[PDB]
Symmetry: C2
Subunit: 93 residues, 2 copies
């Protein structure tokens, strides 16, 4: 439970930006909802959930996983069931 609620605390209210292999934004609202923006701004809305292993499930509108590197960074891991990791990082803004 410790890991999960630590990830929860670090993310909610936070907006994370980075250019993935497309300038991308991911906002984890504290109400449990989420927003993703891509650049011709494409927009995706939905909710985010945290497992007990720490991973963050994002269901927009099929699932996007996210890992919390540190308090201010998050890595896009791709869909569930999936040395250039730094290019998938999203820094808090």
């Amino acid at each position: 439970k410790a890991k999960a609620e630590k990830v929860e605390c670090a993310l909610k209210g936070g907006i994370f930006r980075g250019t993935l292999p497309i300038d991308t934004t991911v906002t984890f609202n504290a109400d449990g909802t989420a927003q993703k923006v891509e650049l011709s701004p494409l927009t995706y809305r939905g909710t985010w959930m945290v497992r007990e292993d720490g991973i963050v499930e994002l269901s927009l509108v099929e699932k996007e996983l996210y890992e919390l590197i540190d308090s201010n960074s998050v890595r896009y891991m791709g869909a569930p069931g999936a040395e250039m990791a730094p290019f998938y990082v999203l820094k808090k803004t």
Copy 2:
């Protein structure tokens, strides 16, 4: 609700230190399981903590104490219930920094 959660997050797993007026070198640890301890100069205390809807932290020691979260790394000893310390010029001396 939204306020208390931020206060919860910023605190749990955190150990805060400061020299409160007498000055007493003091430690307060907010364990993430809801428990807590205080160390003074070594007088050790033990108990629990929680956050109200106003954002204030109640601390029940054994061997009540109110705390305000200034920033993500600082808390201020306010006093006891019904016995707050609103003195501005005196406020900085009641602060406890995280580490």
